[PDB]
DNA sequence: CACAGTGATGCAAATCAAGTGTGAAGCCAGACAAAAACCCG
DNA sequence: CACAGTGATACAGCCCTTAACAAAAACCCG
DNA sequence: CGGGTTTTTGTCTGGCTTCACACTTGATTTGCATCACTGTGTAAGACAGGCCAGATCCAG
DNA sequence: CTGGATCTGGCCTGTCTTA
DNA sequence: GATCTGGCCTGTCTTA
DNA sequence: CGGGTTTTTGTTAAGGGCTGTATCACTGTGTAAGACAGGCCAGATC
């Protein structure tokens, strides 16, 4: 997992001039398996996959998230280890016993811009939107059903050579057709995902601005200024702080957004609906969306929720159906990313892996909710030692021998 | 941890803590102005008062949209002055004054 | 400041009435420097309120208003008129801070300057002081800013810049008469510790007054 | 299906006594076995 | 002359050992 | 492949400890459950569309 | 030979997408 | 019918 | 009131090891609006 932590604030004294800025790195074991017999077994699978109690810190440093220069600089020699360990394997002492280990590794706690950054890919405003598959915003407007996964990293650098030698002679559009968006070397061998949070989040802003477009019938006034829409937007938060006793705020969060997906919210938002065709249409929305949320968020789909897993299909034609049909006014050509990821590509990734909601990227933010805290009352400050002593105690902190500790009652 | 480790209590469980605390706060000792305050109830017992003073909060009139609490002032200068006793008799004892003596003593308060 | 004018009733601090302890102007203020007692106590205000809202005399606007010496609010808070030694210090080095910034630039040979130089001004000043005194670029007036700003290896990383030599000695003397006054209004007894600074409190404010007079008419004339 | 906390508030469970006479698990005088892990035979 | 921290490092301080001597505080007897 | 030489220990044996061991029952002290919210997700880039500017062609 | 109708280039500017 | 007045604005400084 | 006799109490040197305290370079809390002078156009005017 990575991500960049911005409003980190810079110290006086002496040193080279620190950007205000900061990135972390970490990682985290999933499950251990030993191969007894004929078959396989596991033997340790974390419990709770985003907690913060076992994300444990391996690279620290105050830099921007979009200085490729400095970001590749620090982040070269991980990769080049990580390489090196994937074709060998451990002998390690455990009870006064040596044991055999070996590495699989996948990088999934990465949000799409840093996906984007990292493997070379184009902006999230491309055309080409999706990460996983080859289609554009066009095309991703009228399937939205049938779809396949085709990015890899193997891929990815055989596209950015023909990009840079340009064997056939060709134009730069019709280049980039043949390369499908790819202008820059990856670099970090990754695996296909699809981020549970960042999905959640997205979702949830979409549904806020239906909601709100709702509110003013634009579906028969195509036509509407400036002020009309802001007044609109000020209507539904004086609606929600009234009904669903929720904070207007500037910018998504996540316990905002699992609070807004609810039938009771629709319920009340249907009090500023003068129509009832609409409500049927928002009724029906929210229950495709709640009904198909658990298949991709849940820990263990497959006993958690296995109706909602094999009447996964159904349900997200049904749902491109009602987008399709009365949403016509906005999804005409034209659609968010995690529409279309969430649409064409998780019942591959469901059966491929198993599970998405244990492979996301909470954890990590949680890990910078610690370093927070850490840089600011378990550090000397000074630029020279604080983020040495960071990483020591958070390290520290990780470890599951001290937690070991705690459970004294059982 | 400690006590189902170290099999005995070093410390003391919440509720004793909890217990102990209504000492420290104010509206826990008695007193009394010999001139009686003007629009000021003798009570003695008063802890964290409301800080809207019972204001209206009607439709009709001005409306509210904050939120306040606060002690009662002469209450809270009591509980400190008892806070302090240790420090004013350590104090009478060093400048050479007998402890048992109860003049006009005189407080100076910074807001 | 603010609250004290606030609750006090009195406008706001950009007025032409400063000070809350003296009722003089802002010229007046600007010329004398030397000689203000205080005839401000709390009834007081509540008098010159009275004086503002029943109007005995029949004045006009600014009649009234030079009358009450800027009263439009009843008092509803007994303040002390004394001055914050921490909010002091703040603005002083704000002040100084400026200072520098138009020393750099030369003002006093060239009235006119664009935004642009300002920029490149502070830009320079503020590389300096990265580069020699290991401090960074704050957007307000910060606490340890100050207290550290107020050096005199300072003075001479600043004068490192400016071409000219006799405004060094200025400076020079400038903060020297500062430093001088600085230990009598942040000790808490200067009667006990500091009696010298206190005793010669007074020359030194006068001697800071006929610099700031003389020597640096660009800035406070007026 | 994020999650490890925040507080007080409340209820349920342990305890704890001060009375009291009986019951019970070590400890001892030697001391020859009863195995049991070493030597190598 | 705001002032309480903030983690690592160095050094003083205060315990430990052996080894014969040497001084201090008491009770039988004269 | 098993004869000697040391640990490692319940044992006998009855007479002695400090410990152990049954109802009360009203407070008293812990220990656990319950409930309304929470913080970490926090600046640029791609793209369509309108708009003049100066170049593009047309006329007597 | 001149003026006169008109026709893309790019630029700048909101707008949508991820953070 | 130019000619000041009034109010409108607008950048700067003063506390935070 | 002392010898004879006895049990406590230091005392030196050198080295080891655990504990406590000073020292270093820094931070986070002092963070939005209003008063005022100057310029300038719209407009009543004598
Ligand atoms: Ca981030
Ligand atoms: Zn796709
Ligand atoms: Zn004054």
Not at chain 1, 249 to 275: H, W, Y
Not at chain 1, 360 to 368: F, L, T, V
Not at chain 1, 389 to 398: A, I
Not at chain 2, 25 to 44: A, C, D, I, M
């Amino acid at each position: 997992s990575c991500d960049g932590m911005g409003d980190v604030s810079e110290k006086h004294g002496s040193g080279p001039a620190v950007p205000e800025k900061a990135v972390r790195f970490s990682f985290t074991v999933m499950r251990i398996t030993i191969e007894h017999g004929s078959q396989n077994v596991k033997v340790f699978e974390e419990p709770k996959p985003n907690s913060e109690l076992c994300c444990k810190p391996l690279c620290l440093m105050l830099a921007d998230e979009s200085d490729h220069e400095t970001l590749t600089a620090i982040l070269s020699p991980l990769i080049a280890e990580r390489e090196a360990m994937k074709s060998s394997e451990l002998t390690l002492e455990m009870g006064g016993i040596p044991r055999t280990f070996k590495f699989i590794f996948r990088g999934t706690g990465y949000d799409e811009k840093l996906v984007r950054e990292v493997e070379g890919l184009e902006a999230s405003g491309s055309v080409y939107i999706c990460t996983l598959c080859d289609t554009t915003r066009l095309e991703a407007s009228q399937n939205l059903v049938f779809h396949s996964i085709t990015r890899s990293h193997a891929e990815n650098l055989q596209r950015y050579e023909v990009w840079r030698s340009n064997p056939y002679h060709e134009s730069v559009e019709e280049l980039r057709d043949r390369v499908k968006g790819v202008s820059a070397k990856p670099f970090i061998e990754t695996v296909p995902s699809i981020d549970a949070l960042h999905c959640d989040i997205g979702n949830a802003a979409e549904f806020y601005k239906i909601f709100q477009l709702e509110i003013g019938e634009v579906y028969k006034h195509p036509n509407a200024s400036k002020e009309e829409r802001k007044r609109w937007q000020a209507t539904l938060d004086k609606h929600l702080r009234k009904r669903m006793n929720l904070k207007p705020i500037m910018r998504m969060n996540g316990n905002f957004a699992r609070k807004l997906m609810t039938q009771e919210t629709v319920d009340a938002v249907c009090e500023l609906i003068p129509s009832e065709e609409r409500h049927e249409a928002l009724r029906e929305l929210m229950d495709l969306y709640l009904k198909m949320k658990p298949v991709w968020r849940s820990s263990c789909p497959a006993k958690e929720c296995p109706e909602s897993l094999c009447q996964y299909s159904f349900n997200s034609q049904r749902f491109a159906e009602l987008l399709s049909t009365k949403f016509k006014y906005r999804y005409e050509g034209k659609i968010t990313n995690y529409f279309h990821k969430t649409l064409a590509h998780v019942p591959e990734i469901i059966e491929r892996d198993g599970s998405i909601g244990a492979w996301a990227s909470e954890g990590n933010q949680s890990g910078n909710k610690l370093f927070r805290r850490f840089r600011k009352m378990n550090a000397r400050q000074s630029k020279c030692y604080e983020m040495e002593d960071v990483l020591k105690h958070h390290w520290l902190y990780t470890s599951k021998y001290l937690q070991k500790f705690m459970n004294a009652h059982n | 941890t400690v006590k189902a480790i170290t099999g005995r209590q070093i410390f003391q469980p919440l509720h004793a803590l909890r217990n102990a605390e209504k000492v420290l706060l104010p509206g826990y000792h008695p007193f009394e102005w010999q001139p009686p305050l003007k629009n000021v109830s003798s009570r003695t017992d008063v802890g964290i008062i409301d800080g809207l003073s019972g204001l209206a909060s009607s439709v009709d009139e001005y409306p509210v949209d904050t939120i306040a609490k606060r002690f009662r002032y002469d209450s809270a200068l009591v509980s400190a002055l008892m806070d302090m006793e240790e420090d004013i008799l350590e104090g009478m004892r060093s400048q050479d004054l007998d402890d048992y003596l109860n003049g006009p003593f005189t407080v100076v308060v910074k807001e």
